[PDB]
């Protein structure tokens, strides 16, 4: 009983014992999307959301998540534990002030140096994959929240201080906010 609605703004009917989704992308009048905690092993449809300015798909068991590049614009987009190897829509929806990688398998970030608008560049529980994403993030200066995060290069306490000194433009540094 979650097919469609005319005047709807908030919807949350997840955490069901049965992984059944019926018409999850039927309406087109929504502005904020919260598709996280999906019990289905894959997402139903995400390319139809072209007018939503907020995307939340955190802690979702939907391993297959496609259609992220079909959105014209999205101010917020959360892709934590989305099961997607790469983040789509970075070039299309480049007006996002927040970005979630959540231990992204990608070595570098998809156009982070040219992304001078994302103030929340979070990559939680990173290995890390590579330092190219770090260099791309350090190239910009309009970021506030930056998460590396919990990578293998943090063993030396001097490395943390050097990283903090190198990136003063980020208002917050993962857990402990950067003094800036």
């Amino acid at each position: 009983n979650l097919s469609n609605l005319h005047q709807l703004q908030m919807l949350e009917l997840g955490s069901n014992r049965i992984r059944a989704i019926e018409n999850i992308d039927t309406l087109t009048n929504l502005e904020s999307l919260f598709l996280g905690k999906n019990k289905i092993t894959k997402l139903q449809n995400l390319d139809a959301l072209t007018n939503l300015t907020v995307l939340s798909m955190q802690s979702n068991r939907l391993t297959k998540i496609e259609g992220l590049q079909n959105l014209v614009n999205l101010r917020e987009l959360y892709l934590s534990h989305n099961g997607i190897e790469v983040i789509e829509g970075l070039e299309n929806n480049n007006k996002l002030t927040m970005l979630d990688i959540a231990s992204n398998r990608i070595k570098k970030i998809e156009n982070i140096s040219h992304l001078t608008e994302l103030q929340e560049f979070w990559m939680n529980d990173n290995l890390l994959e590579s330092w190219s994403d770090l260099d791309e993030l350090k190239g910009a200066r309009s970021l506030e929240t930056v998460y590396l995060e919990r990578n293998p290069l943090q063993k030396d306490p001097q490395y943390r201080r050097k990283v903090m000194l190198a990136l003063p433009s980020v208002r917050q540094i993962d857990a402990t906010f950067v003094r800036f």
């Binding site: 949350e12 955490s15 996280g36 955190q58 857990a175």
Partner: protein, 298 residues
């Protein structure tokens, strides 16, 4: 705690008292920088104490509040509100609903104002993970953002584990365990920590006091090792222990004395999930290690 932190603590205490005797569901929110500082101070203070705490007799130890603001307020009104009385929850202090946050904030404020009059523990229902306890992680995700949720998770992981009442009664969440050997490795296990699926702390938080086993076996969580009567007896004989607290279960009588009044299964869970009309109770520990069954509403 700090001037802003102490002012917020007093405001939260007043709000809880004004919400005392009424329906549950209090939240007790705060500012951004003030809440960050309060969380940092609480994490530092909780990590400062060892995993094995010691209770200050006399005290009014409650059962499993199950994250109920009304139940916690009733316990404060009857058993003694903080810091006028020492409170020590056995476990399952947070659960489904929007009322565990108020109880956690009140406990943290009481510990900041008086650490010798505030204590709480977690069980199968108050675990740090949404797999066993989603009454905190999902609630924070729905209400608040992810940074505050991460800060709260870190502060909770930076908390103690067990407590003892004059080395007489063990304030455990559930039953005994076959993996727990002595207190040397317990005090050595500092922050961070969490309730596992199997082991010793896992059996304490998820499993309950078992009698169908002797040394070890399966538990109600399905992975925990609910140590039987023989294991609990051997642990008590080796460690000179006499009583162990049990919670995280739907108790029809609230406080059940097991192992011949050696496992006071005090549970403060009133009307668990509505259908299971579990009774509420508390363990009134006097100054002379006198454990009394302070039953409450169901």
């Amino acid at each position: 705690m700090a001037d802003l932190d102490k002012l917020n603590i007093d405001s939260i205490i007043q709000r809880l008292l004004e919400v005392r005797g009424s329906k549950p569901g209090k939240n007790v929110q705060l500012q951004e920088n003030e809440i960050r500082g309060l969380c940092l101070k609480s994490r530092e203070i909780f990590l400062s104490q060892p995993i094995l705490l010691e209770l200050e007799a006399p005290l009014k130890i409650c059962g499993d509040i199950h994250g109920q603001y009304y139940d916690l307020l009733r316990l404060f009104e009857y058993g003694g509100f903080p810091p006028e009385s020492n409170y020590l929850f056995l476990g399952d202090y947070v659960d489904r609903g929007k009322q565990s946050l108020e109880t956690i904030c009140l406990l943290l404020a009481y510990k900041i104002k008086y650490p010798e009059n505030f204590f709480l523990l977690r069980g199968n229902h108050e675990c740090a993970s949404i797999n066993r306890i989603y009454g905190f992680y999902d609630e924070c995700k729905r209400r608040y953002n992810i940074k505050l949720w991460k800060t709260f998770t870190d502060c909770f992981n930076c908390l103690p584990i067990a407590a003892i009442v004059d080395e007489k009664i063990f304030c455990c969440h559930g039953g005994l365990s076959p993996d727990l050997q002595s207190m040397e490795q317990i005090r050595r296990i500092m922050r961070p920590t969490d309730v596992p699926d199997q082991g010793l702390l896992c059996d304490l938080l998820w499993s309950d006091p078992d009698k169908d086993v002797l040394g070890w076996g399966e538990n109600d969580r399905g992975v925990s090792f609910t140590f039987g009567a023989e294991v609990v007896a051997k642990f008590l004989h080796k460690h000179d222990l006499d009583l162990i607290c049990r919670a995280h279960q739907v108790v029809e009588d609230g406080y059940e004395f097991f192992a011949k009044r050696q496992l006071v299964t005090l549970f403060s869970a009133p009307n668990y999930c509505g259908e299971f009309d579990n009774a509420g109770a508390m363990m009134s520990v006097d100054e002379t290690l006198m454990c009394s069954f302070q039953i409450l509403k169901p």
